[PDB]
Coordinates of N, CA and C in Angstrom, one line a residue:
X1 N 0.9 -1.2 0.0 CA 0.0 0.0 0.0 C 0.9 1.2 0.0
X2 N 0.3 2.4 0.1 CA 1.0 3.6 0.5 C 1.2 3.6 2.0
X3 N 2.4 3.8 2.5 CA 2.7 3.9 3.9 C 2.4 5.3 4.4
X4 N 1.8 5.3 5.7 CA 1.8 6.6 6.5 C 3.3 6.9 6.8
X5 N 3.6 8.2 7.1 CA 4.9 8.6 7.3 C 5.5 7.9 8.5
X6 N 4.9 8.1 9.7 CA 5.3 7.5 10.9 C 5.2 5.9 10.9
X7 N 4.2 5.4 10.1 CA 4.1 3.9 10.0 C 5.4 3.3 9.4
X8 N 5.9 4.0 8.4 CA 7.2 3.6 7.7 C 8.3 3.8 8.6
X9 N 8.4 4.9 9.3 CA 9.5 5.2 10.3 C 9.7 4.1 11.3
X10 N 8.7 3.4 11.8 CA 8.8 2.3 12.8 C 9.1 0.9 12.0
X11 N 8.7 0.8 10.8 CA 8.9 -0.3 10.0 C 10.4 -0.5 9.7
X12 N 11.0 0.6 9.3 CA 12.5 0.6 8.9 C 13.3 0.8 10.2
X13 N 12.6 1.2 11.3 CA 13.3 1.1 12.6 C 13.6 -0.3 13.1
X14 N 12.5 -1.1 13.0 CA 12.7 -2.5 13.5 C 13.5 -3.4 12.5
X15 N 13.8 -2.9 11.3 CA 14.7 -3.5 10.4 C 16.2 -3.1 10.5
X16 N 16.5 -2.4 11.6 CA 17.9 -2.1 12.0 C 18.5 -1.0 11.2
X17 N 17.8 0.0 10.7 CA 18.3 1.0 9.7 C 18.6 2.4 10.3
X18 N 18.3 2.6 11.6 CA 18.7 3.9 12.2 C 20.2 4.0 12.5
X19 N 20.8 5.0 11.9 CA 22.3 5.2 12.1 C 23.0 4.0 11.4
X20 N 22.4 3.4 10.4 CA 23.1 2.3 9.7 C 24.1 3.0 8.7
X21 N 25.3 2.5 8.8 CA 26.4 3.1 8.1 C 26.7 4.6 8.4
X22 N 26.1 5.2 9.5 CA 26.1 6.6 9.8 C 24.9 7.4 9.3
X23 N 24.0 6.8 8.6 CA 22.8 7.5 8.1 C 21.6 7.3 9.0
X24 N 21.1 8.4 9.7 CA 20.0 8.4 10.6 C 18.7 7.9 10.0
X25 N 17.8 7.5 10.8 CA 16.5 7.1 10.4 C 15.8 8.0 9.4
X26 N 15.9 9.3 9.7 CA 15.4 10.4 8.9 C 15.8 10.3 7.5
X27 N 17.1 10.1 7.3 CA 17.7 10.0 5.9 C 17.1 8.9 5.1
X28 N 16.6 7.8 5.7 CA 15.9 6.7 5.0 C 14.5 7.0 4.7
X29 N 13.7 7.5 5.7 CA 12.3 7.8 5.5 C 12.2 9.1 4.6
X30 N 13.1 10.0 4.6 CA 13.1 11.1 3.7 C 13.3 10.7 2.2
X31 N 14.3 9.8 2.0 CA 14.5 9.2 0.7 C 13.2 8.6 0.1
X32 N 12.5 7.8 1.0 CA 11.3 7.1 0.6 C 10.2 8.0 0.0
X33 N 10.1 9.3 0.6 CA 9.1 10.2 0.1 C 9.3 10.8 -1.3
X34 N 10.6 11.0 -1.6 CA 10.9 11.6 -2.9 C 11.3 10.5 -3.9
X35 N 11.7 9.3 -3.5 CA 11.9 8.2 -4.4 C 10.6 7.6 -4.9
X36 N 9.7 7.2 -3.9 CA 8.5 6.5 -4.2 C 7.2 7.2 -3.7
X37 N 7.3 8.2 -2.9 CA 6.1 8.8 -2.2 C 5.4 7.8 -1.3
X38 N 6.2 7.1 -0.5 CA 5.8 6.0 0.4 C 5.1 4.8 -0.3
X39 N 5.1 4.7 -1.6 CA 4.4 3.7 -2.3 C 5.2 2.4 -2.5
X40 N 4.8 1.3 -2.0 CA 5.5 0.0 -2.1 C 5.4 -0.5 -3.6
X41 N 4.3 -0.2 -4.3 CA 4.2 -0.7 -5.7 C 4.7 0.3 -6.8
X42 N 5.5 1.3 -6.4 CA 6.0 2.3 -7.4 C 7.1 1.7 -8.3
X43 N 7.0 2.1 -9.6 CA 7.9 1.7 -10.6 C 8.1 2.8 -11.7
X44 N 9.3 2.8 -12.3 CA 9.6 3.8 -13.3 C 10.5 3.1 -14.5
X45 N 10.3 3.6 -15.7 CA 11.2 3.1 -16.8 C 12.2 4.2 -17.3
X46 N 13.4 3.8 -17.0 CA 14.6 4.6 -17.5 C 14.9 4.3 -18.9
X47 N 15.6 5.2 -19.6 CA 15.9 5.1 -21.0 C 16.7 3.9 -21.4
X48 N 17.7 3.6 -20.6 CA 18.7 2.5 -20.6 C 18.0 1.2 -21.1
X49 N 16.7 0.9 -20.6 CA 16.0 -0.3 -20.8 C 16.0 -1.1 -19.5
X50 N 16.3 -0.5 -18.4 CA 16.2 -1.1 -17.0 C 15.0 -0.5 -16.3
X51 N 14.7 -1.1 -15.2 CA 13.5 -0.6 -14.4 C 13.8 -0.3 -12.9
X52 N 13.1 0.6 -12.4 CA 13.2 1.2 -11.1 C 12.0 0.6 -10.3
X53 N 12.2 0.2 -9.0 CA 11.1 -0.6 -8.3 C 11.1 -0.4 -6.8
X54 N 9.8 -0.3 -6.3 CA 9.5 -0.4 -4.9 C 9.7 0.9 -4.1
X55 N 9.8 0.8 -2.8 CA 9.8 1.9 -1.9 C 11.0 2.8 -2.0
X56 N 12.2 2.2 -2.3 CA 13.4 3.0 -2.5 C 14.0 3.0 -4.0
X57 N 13.1 2.6 -4.9 CA 13.5 2.7 -6.4 C 14.8 2.0 -6.8
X58 N 15.0 0.8 -6.3 CA 16.2 0.0 -6.5 C 16.3 -0.4 -8.0
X59 N 17.2 0.2 -8.7 CA 17.3 -0.1 -10.2 C 17.7 -1.5 -10.6
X60 N 17.1 -2.0 -11.6 CA 17.4 -3.4 -12.1 C 18.7 -3.6 -12.8
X61 N 19.4 -2.6 -13.4 CA 20.6 -2.7 -14.1 C 21.8 -3.2 -13.3
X62 N 21.7 -3.1 -12.0 CA 22.7 -3.6 -11.0 C 22.2 -4.6 -10.0
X63 N 21.0 -4.4 -9.4 CA 20.7 -5.0 -8.1 C 19.7 -6.2 -8.0
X64 N 18.7 -6.2 -8.9 CA 17.6 -7.2 -8.9 C 17.3 -7.8 -10.3
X65 N 16.7 -9.0 -10.3 CA 16.4 -9.7 -11.6 C 14.9 -9.5 -12.0
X66 N 14.6 -9.0 -13.1 CA 13.2 -8.9 -13.6 C 13.0 -9.6 -15.0
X67 N 14.1 -10.2 -15.5 CA 14.1 -10.8 -16.9 C 13.8 -9.9 -18.1
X68 N 13.9 -8.5 -17.8 CA 13.7 -7.6 -18.9 C 14.9 -6.6 -19.1
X69 N 16.0 -6.9 -18.5 CA 17.2 -6.0 -18.5 C 18.4 -6.8 -18.9
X70 N 18.8 -6.5 -20.2 CA 19.9 -7.3 -20.8 C 21.3 -7.1 -20.2
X71 N 22.2 -8.1 -20.3 CA 23.5 -8.0 -19.7 C 23.7 -7.3 -18.4
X72 N 22.9 -7.7 -17.4 CA 23.0 -7.1 -16.0 C 23.3 -8.1 -14.9
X73 N 23.7 -7.5 -13.8 CA 24.1 -8.3 -12.6 C 22.9 -8.3 -11.7
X74 N 23.0 -9.2 -10.6 CA 22.0 -9.4 -9.6 C 22.6 -9.4 -8.2
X75 N 23.1 -8.2 -7.8 CA 24.0 -8.1 -6.6 C 23.4 -8.5 -5.3
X76 N 22.1 -8.0 -5.1 CA 21.3 -8.3 -3.9 C 20.7 -9.7 -4.0
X77 N 20.7 -10.3 -5.1 CA 20.3 -11.8 -5.3 C 18.8 -12.0 -5.1
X78 N 18.0 -11.2 -5.7 CA 16.5 -11.2 -5.5 C 15.8 -11.0 -6.8
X79 N 14.6 -11.6 -7.0 CA 13.8 -11.1 -8.1 C 13.3 -9.7 -7.9
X80 N 13.1 -8.9 -8.9 CA 12.7 -7.5 -8.7 C 11.2 -7.4 -8.3
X81 N 10.4 -8.4 -8.5 CA 9.0 -8.5 -8.0 C 8.9 -8.5 -6.5
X82 N 10.0 -8.9 -5.8 CA 10.0 -8.9 -4.3 C 10.1 -7.5 -3.7
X83 N 10.7 -6.6 -4.5 CA 10.8 -5.2 -4.1 C 9.4 -4.4 -4.2
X84 N 8.4 -5.1 -4.8 CA 7.0 -4.6 -4.9 C 6.1 -5.1 -3.7
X85 N 6.6 -6.0 -2.9 CA 5.7 -6.6 -1.9 C 5.5 -5.6 -0.7
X86 N 4.3 -5.7 -0.1 CA 3.9 -4.7 1.0 C 4.8 -4.9 2.3
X87 N 5.4 -6.0 2.5 CA 6.4 -6.2 3.6 C 7.8 -5.7 3.0
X88 N 8.4 -4.8 3.7 CA 9.6 -4.1 3.2 C 10.9 -4.8 3.4
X89 N 10.9 -6.1 3.8 CA 12.1 -6.8 4.2 C 13.2 -6.9 3.1
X90 N 12.8 -7.2 1.9 CA 13.7 -7.4 0.7 C 14.3 -6.1 0.2
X91 N 13.5 -5.1 0.2 CA 13.9 -3.7 0.0 C 15.0 -3.2 1.0
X92 N 14.8 -3.5 2.2 CA 15.7 -3.1 3.3 C 17.0 -3.9 3.2
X93 N 16.9 -5.2 3.1 CA 18.0 -6.1 3.0 C 19.0 -5.7 1.8
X94 N 18.4 -5.3 0.7 CA 19.2 -4.9 -0.5 C 19.8 -3.5 -0.4
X95 N 19.0 -2.6 0.1 CA 19.5 -1.2 0.4 C 20.7 -1.2 1.3
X96 N 20.7 -2.0 2.3 CA 21.8 -2.2 3.2 C 23.1 -2.6 2.5
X97 N 23.0 -3.4 1.4 CA 24.1 -3.8 0.6 C 24.4 -2.7 -0.4
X98 N 23.4 -1.9 -0.9 CA 23.7 -0.8 -1.8 C 24.4 0.3 -1.1
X99 N 24.0 0.8 0.1 CA 24.6 1.9 0.9 C 26.0 1.6 1.3
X100 N 26.3 0.3 1.6 CA 27.7 -0.2 1.9 C 28.7 -0.1 0.8
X101 N 28.2 -0.2 -0.4 CA 29.1 -0.2 -1.7 C 30.3 0.7 -1.6
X102 N 30.2 2.0 -1.2 CA 31.2 3.0 -1.2 C 30.8 4.4 -1.5
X103 N 29.7 4.6 -2.2 CA 29.1 5.9 -2.4 C 28.1 6.4 -1.4
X104 N 27.7 5.4 -0.5 CA 26.7 5.8 0.6 C 25.3 6.0 0.0
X105 N 24.7 7.0 0.5 CA 23.3 7.4 0.1 C 23.2 8.1 -1.2
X106 N 24.3 8.4 -1.8 CA 24.3 9.1 -3.1 C 23.8 8.2 -4.2
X107 N 23.7 6.9 -3.9 CA 23.0 5.9 -4.8 C 21.6 6.3 -5.2
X108 N 20.9 7.0 -4.3 CA 19.5 7.5 -4.6 C 19.6 9.0 -5.0
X109 N 19.0 9.2 -6.2 CA 19.1 10.6 -6.8 C 18.1 11.6 -6.1
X110 N 16.9 11.1 -5.7 CA 15.9 11.9 -5.0 C 16.4 12.3 -3.6
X111 N 17.2 11.4 -3.0 CA 17.8 11.6 -1.7 C 18.8 12.8 -1.9
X112 N 19.8 12.5 -2.7 CA 20.9 13.5 -3.0 C 20.3 14.9 -3.3
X113 N 19.3 14.9 -4.1 CA 18.7 16.2 -4.6 C 17.9 16.9 -3.5
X114 N 17.0 16.1 -2.8 CA 16.1 16.8 -1.9 C 16.3 16.6 -0.4
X115 N 17.2 15.7 0.0 CA 17.3 15.3 1.4 C 18.7 15.6 2.1
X116 N 19.8 15.4 1.3 CA 21.2 15.7 1.8 C 21.4 17.1 2.3
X117 N 22.0 17.2 3.5 CA 22.3 18.5 4.1 C 21.1 19.3 4.6
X118 N 20.0 18.7 4.9 CA 18.8 19.4 5.4 C 18.5 18.9 6.8
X119 N 17.5 19.5 7.5 CA 17.0 19.1 8.8 C 16.3 17.8 8.7
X120 N 17.1 16.7 8.7 CA 16.6 15.3 8.5 C 15.7 14.8 9.7
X121 N 15.7 15.5 10.8 CA 14.9 15.0 12.0 C 13.4 15.5 12.0
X122 N 13.1 16.5 11.2 CA 11.6 16.9 11.0 C 10.8 15.7 10.6
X123 N 11.4 15.0 9.7 CA 11.0 13.7 9.2 C 10.6 12.6 10.2
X124 N 11.1 12.6 11.4 CA 10.8 11.6 12.4 C 9.9 12.2 13.5
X125 N 9.7 13.5 13.5 CA 9.0 14.2 14.6 C 7.5 13.9 14.6
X126 N 6.9 13.7 15.7 CA 5.5 13.3 15.9 C 5.4 11.9 16.2
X127 N 6.2 11.0 15.5 CA 6.0 9.6 15.7 C 6.6 9.1 17.0
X128 N 6.1 7.9 17.5 CA 6.6 7.4 18.8 C 7.6 6.3 18.5
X129 N 8.7 6.4 19.1 CA 9.8 5.4 19.0 C 9.9 4.6 20.3

């Protein structure tokens, strides 16, 4: 479904993502608003011929298999359809491997553009931890 803001904040909380690699919970939930608008079924088609998928827009040319993307790798080792499921476990598991790569949160373009260097805690305020 579409997640409520604070609903998602506790979902990715229990998945061990707060201060993961140095990136606070806010940096993850903020990413999700501009990447997918909290939508678990969000998808986009890039010019390349690869596909963007799920809550954090994990692109298929590197990370997941959808059978529609030629000469590509499958680094997180999942089908791309699992990134569309309402339970966010496969999206979190893979994003943990994406962020570790070496570029950090710069892997997400909507994060880099709209979230980096801002008041990232407004994003968590109101919710109960």
